[PDB]
Amino acid sequence: AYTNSFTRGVYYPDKVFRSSVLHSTQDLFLPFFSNVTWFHANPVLPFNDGVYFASTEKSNIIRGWIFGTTLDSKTQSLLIVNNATNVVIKVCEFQFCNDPFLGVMESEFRVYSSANNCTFEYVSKNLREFVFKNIDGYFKIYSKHTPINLVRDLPQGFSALEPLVDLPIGINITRFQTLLALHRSAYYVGYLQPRTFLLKYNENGTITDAVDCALDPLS
Amino acid sequence: ETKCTLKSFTVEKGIYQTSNFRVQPTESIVRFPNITNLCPFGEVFNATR
Amino acid sequence: YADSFVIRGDEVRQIAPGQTGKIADYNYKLPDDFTGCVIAWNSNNL
Amino acid sequence: SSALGKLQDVVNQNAQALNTLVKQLSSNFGAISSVLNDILSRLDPP
Amino acid sequence: YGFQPTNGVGYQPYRVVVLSFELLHAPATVCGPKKSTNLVKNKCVNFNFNGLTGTGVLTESNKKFLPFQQFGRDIADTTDAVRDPQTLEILDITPCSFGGVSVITPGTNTSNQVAVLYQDVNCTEVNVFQTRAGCLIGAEHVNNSYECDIPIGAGICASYQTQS
Ligand SMILES: *[C@@H]1O[C@H](CO)[C@@H](O[C@@H]2O[C@H](CO)[C@@H](O)[C@H](O)[C@H]2NC(C)=O)[C@H](O)[C@H]1NC(C)=O
Ligand SMILES: *[C@@H]1O[C@H](CO)[C@@H](O[C@@H]2O[C@H](CO)[C@@H](O)[C@H](O)[C@H]2NC(C)=O)[C@H](O)[C@H]1NC(C)=O
Ligand SMILES: *[C@@H]1O[C@H](CO)[C@@H](O)[C@H](O)[C@H]1NC(C)=O
Ligand SMILES: *[C@@H]1O[C@H](CO)[C@@H](O)[C@H](O)[C@H]1NC(C)=O
Ligand SMILES: *[C@@H]1O[C@H](CO)[C@@H](O)[C@H](O)[C@H]1NC(C)=O
Ligand SMILES: *[C@@H]1O[C@H](CO)[C@@H](O)[C@H](O)[C@H]1NC(C)=O
Ligand SMILES: *[C@@H]1O[C@H](CO)[C@@H](O)[C@H](O)[C@H]1NC(C)=O
Ligand SMILES: *[C@@H]1O[C@H](CO)[C@@H](O)[C@H](O)[C@H]1NC(C)=O
Ligand SMILES: *[C@@H]1O[C@H](CO)[C@@H](O)[C@H](O)[C@H]1NC(C)=O
Ligand SMILES: *[C@@H]1O[C@H](CO)[C@@H](O)[C@H](O)[C@H]1NC(C)=O
């Protein structure tokens, strides 16, 4: 299936506060009214320039992503996981199952079978959006958690995404995947292009509205 | 100063812009994130075995 | 003004208008507003 | 109480010009940055 | 090695640590510390917050950033606020007073007395009389109204009477 975003995938493109103004930016955005894939419950996707990624549930079936160029050994990759404990970022050379996942006893993690040469570690319904990008050896992640009053369909509205993480890795990326918690006892993928937007800033400094300046003559 | 900026030993009545003025910085300050991970080389240079 | 001396064969490009180097930063400097000639010729036979 | 466009236009023109003057303090014109404290920090005087 | 405490030097055990700095091709990594200083308010200073470099006078403010926002800027894109990275407090930035200086002369063919106007400057930062055109030094403020002689501005004029 395919679906239509309406006004989705807007993130704060810098750390700068702004009071009641209209500011114009050039960056990598998800164009308004786009053609976003639909997935149910998954396969190896491309990256090619950033990614928008939403998801919907009350349980937690979406348990992180895996990135990289080959998703195996012989080249390095990232791995972002969340068991019922908390997030586990990790950067080694792995050996990934071609269909990697984790179970739910509640024993799991048939994800990889190798953790060699680790160069970075870290340990510690609902709509959960994420924007992933990778520039100059930094892997930036923006995110937002809005509550839907549906269960698993893409809604309409405006909600800007706030920066979360910054990782000075150096890693090359060309592909990525997803991770799901099996049954033993809905998600979308947009892509980002270089656009020019007009963001409206509140008096507290939040982005409340935007204009995509390449949609139509009025814009 | 008027005679210099007017290039003349006589000046006529009026008001004349002669120079600018500005306050100079008293000192310098520097701010930066706090200190947390300063590397504990007291594990490799301070091992028991 | 004739300034006459002897250097190592490498830092002959260190006698130039405007530069950084261990010979130029410590033992001899020329202004960036230099005007004149620089002559160098080899010497281990003297 | 419910037309002064000729007075509004001369105000607008002057403000639009003064803003364009300040917005030019952030162009390179073919330099490495727009800040003098950045050319005086990663370049030698020559 | 059979090490024994009664061994001549050069046969006693030495511990060795070899540090090897490498530079692959990442974006950055570990570096050395960097001394700093405290903070002062209400004085023209040269500040530096994390790389934000400028000069001016810092006061405390009534803004509220967003937890991830590190400094503010206004229309025309000048920095007019900042967050300092240790208190987590935001501070207003105001340029350090400046202006023009004008001298009021009654004509050198009449006198050598002068008055001085410091344009749009408060009088504290330089008998002494505060106009809306700036701070005026060397002229007496009388209460009568004459025709204008030398225009000061915002309704004020000056003149050489009687002698002053
Ligand atoms: C290993 O740990 C010891 C103890 O904490 C450090 O020894 C200190 O060295 C300083 C400077 O020589 C002395 O003033 C202190 O008196 C020492 N400690 C004690 C408890 O007396 C030593 O510096 C550490 N090694 C390294 C490489 O950091
Ligand atoms: C930075 O470190 C200092 C201490 O080195 C922290 O200062 C404390 O701040 C709290 C307020 O939250 C005060 O109640 C304490 O009295 C302060 N102690 C000292 C010794 O100054 C400061 O909070 C730290 N800030 C950050 C952002 O880490
Ligand atoms: C998205 O692109 C596919 C490509 O064939 C097309 O079939 C589909 O109709 C498009 N969806 C929308 C909403 O335009
Ligand atoms: C969650 O997964 C990480 C991945 O290595 C692991 O380190 C951690 O121990 C797991 N949680 C528990 C409770 O074992
Ligand atoms: C990465 O792992 C392989 C196999 O374990 C090893 O041959 C190689 O030396 C490792 N890389 C580095 C930089 O040591
Ligand atoms: C990423 O892959 C490209 C392939 O064209 C390669 O040239 C580049 O060096 C790689 N990145 C790094 C940091 O080596
Ligand atoms: C945030 O904005 C709202 C409306 O714009 C305003 O009423 C409020 O005072 C602001 N500050 C808050 C909520 O701290
Ligand atoms: C200027 O001075 C000369 C010489 O004393 C005099 O003749 C002339 O009247 C003066 N001009 C005036 C008073 O306007
Ligand atoms: C000048 O400074 C004084 C001293 O704080 C202040 O009270 C006053 O409002 C300022 N402005 C004028 C026009 O006096
Ligand atoms: C000018 O007149 C006012 C009347 O309100 C008075 O308060 C003030 O002291 C007078 N100043 C002088 C210098 O006479």
Neighbour tally for C37: CB within 10 Å: 5
CB atoms within 10 A of CB A209: 14
Three-state helix/strand/coil letters over E7-57: CCCCCCCCCCCCCCCCCCCCCCCCCCCCCCCCCCCCCEEEEEECCEEEEEE
The token pair that represents C21 in the structure block: 């180097």
- Please indicate if any CB of chain D lies within 8 Å of the CB of C23: no
CB E134, CB E120: distance < 8 Å? yes
Beta-carbon-side half-sphere exposure of residue A33 (alpha carbons within 13 Å): 6
Pocket lining: A117 vs ligand 5, CB cutoff 6 Å: yes
Longest dimension (CA), chain D: 65
Q: Give one word for E128, left, alpha or beta, with left for phi > 0 and alpha for psi -120 to 50.
A: beta
Task: Dump the DSSP string for A37-72.
Answer: EEE-----EE-SS-EEE-BB-SS--B---BEESSSS
Q: Do D23 and E77 touch (CB under 8 A)?
A: yes
Secondary structure of residue D23 in the 3-state scheme: helix
Residue A67 in contact with residue A77, Cβ under 8 Å? yes
> Using a 6 Å CB cutoff, which residues line ligand 7?
A 202-204; E 64
Query: Could you give the CA distance from residue A147 to residue A153 in angstroms, rounded to a whole number?
Result: 12
* Surface-to-core class of residue D29, CB atoms within 10 Å of its CB (0-12 exposed, 13-18 middle, 19+ buried): exposed
Cβ-count burial of A143 within 10 angstroms (0-12 exposed, 13-18 middle, 19+ buried)? middle
Q: How many Å lie between the centroid of ligand 4 and the Cα of residue A52?
A: 27
Does the CB of D16 have a partner CB in chain E at under 8 Å?
A: no
Residues whose CB is less than 8 angstroms from the CB of residue B34 and which lie 6 or more positions away in sequence, other chains included: E85, E86
Candidates E128, E140, E135; CA nearest to E164 is E140
Number of domains in chain A: 1
CB nearest E150 (choices: B2, B10, B15): B15
CB-closest option in B15, B21, B32 to E36: B32
> Is E135 exposed, middle or buried, given 0-12, 13-18 or 19+ CB atoms closer than 10 A?
buried
Instruction: Say if residues A196 and A25 touch (Cβ distance below 8 Å).
Output: yes
| DSSP bridge pairs for A38 | A188
Other Cβ atoms closer than 10 A to A78: 22
Mutation target for E interface from B30, B37, B43, B49: give the one with most E CBs within 10 A.
B30
Nearest CB to E69; choose among A17, A136, A169? A17
Q: In angstroms, what separates the C-alpha of D31 from chain C's closest C-alpha?
A: 20
State how far the Cα of A198 lies from the Cα of A18, in Å rounded to an integer: 13
Contact A36, A190 (CB under 8 A): yes
- Residue E137: alpha-carbon gap to chain centroid: 26
Pocket-testing residue among E42, E122, E126, E156, ligand 9, by greatest number of atoms within 8 A of Cβ: E122
Dihedral angle, C-alpha A75, A77, A83, A85, nearest 10 ° = 120
The sign of the CA dihedral A65, A194, E28, A17 is negative
φ, ψ at A77 (rounded to 5°): -150, 165
Structure tokens at A124: 């510690």
Touching subunits of A (3+ CB pairs, under 8 Å) are: E
CB D33 within 8 A of CB E53: no
Question: Cβ(E120)–Cβ(E130) under 8 Å?
Answer: no
- Asked if E86 and B34 count as a contact pair (C-beta separation under 8 A), the reply is yes
Cβ neighbours, 10 Å, residue E111: 13
Do E164 and E140 meet the contact criterion of CB atoms below 8 Å apart? yes
Residue corresponding to tokens 């700068």: A16
- Which helix H or strand E contains A15, and what residues bound it? none
Q: Which of E39, E40, E97 sits opposite B23 (nearest CB)?
A: E97
- Identify the chains in contact with D, defined as 3+ C-beta pairs within 8 A: C, E
Pocket around ligand 4 at a 6 A CB cut-off: A 81, 83, 85, 88, 123
Torsion, Cα of E9, E10, E14, E17 (10° steps): 140
Count of other CB atoms within 10 angstroms of residue A160: 17
- CA E67 to ligand 2 centroid distance, Å: 17
**What are the phi and psi torsion angles at A52 (to 5°)?**
-90, 150
For residue E123, the 8-state DSSP code is: G
Resolution of this PDB entry, in A? 2.8
Q: Among candidates A139, A134, A120, A151, which has minimal Cα distance to A58?
A: A151
* Inter-residue contact E115 to B14 (CB < 8 Å): no
Instruction: Encode burial over B20-43: b for 16+ CB neighbours within 10 A, e otherwise.
Output: eeebeeeeebebbeeeeeeeeeee
Contact B11 E85 (CB under 8 A): no
Q: Which of residues 25-44 of E touch A (CB under 8 A)?
A: 25-29
Residue E42 tokens read as: 């209400």
In chain A, residues with a C-beta closer than 8 Å to the C-beta of E70 are 15-16
From E81's Cα to the closest Cα of chain A, the distance in A is 9
> Which of the listed residues A92, A116, A118, A119 should we mutate to test ligand 5's pocket, taking the one with most ligand atoms within 8 A of CB?
A116
Residues of E in contact with D22 (CB under 8 A): 76, 78
A17: domain CATH number?
Answer: 2.60.120.960
Domain interval for residue A196: 2-219
Q: With contacts defined as CB-CB under 8 Å, which chain C residues touch D43?
A: none
C16: closest chain D residue by CA:
D46
| Cα A131 to Cα A53: distance, rounded to the nearest angstrom | 6
- Contact assessment for residue A16 and residue E78, using Cβ atoms and an 8 Å cutoff: no
d(CA A49, CA A193): 7
Both tokens assigned to B44: 């490799």
First to last CA, chain E: 102
Regarding chains B and E, contact by 3 or more CB pairs under 8 A is answered as yes
Q: Is A67 exposed, middle or buried (0-12, 13-18, 19+ CB in 10 A)?
A: buried
Contact, A186 vs A57, CB < 8 A?
A: yes
Beta-bridge partners for A22? A200
Q: How far apart are CA A122 and CA A118, in angstroms?
A: 11
CB E25 within 8 A of CB B8: no
Query: Is the CB of residue A11 less than 8 Å from the CB of residue A158?
Result: no
What are E72's two structure tokens? 């503010």
Residue C20's alpha-carbon distances to A103, B13, C23, D38, D44, in angstroms, are 64, 56, 8, 19, 9
Give A106's DSSP letter. -
Q: Is B1 on the interface with E (CB under 8 A)?
A: yes
Residue closest via CA to ligand 9's atom 8 equals E122
Query: Which helix (H) or strand (E) covers residue D16, if one does?
Result: helix D5-22
Report how far residue E27's alpha carbon sits from residue A170's, in angstroms, rounded to the nearest whole number: 6
**DSSP at E125:** G
Q: Is A1 in the pocket of ligand 3 (CB under 6 A)?
A: no
Other CB atoms within 10 Å distance of the CB of residue E22: 5
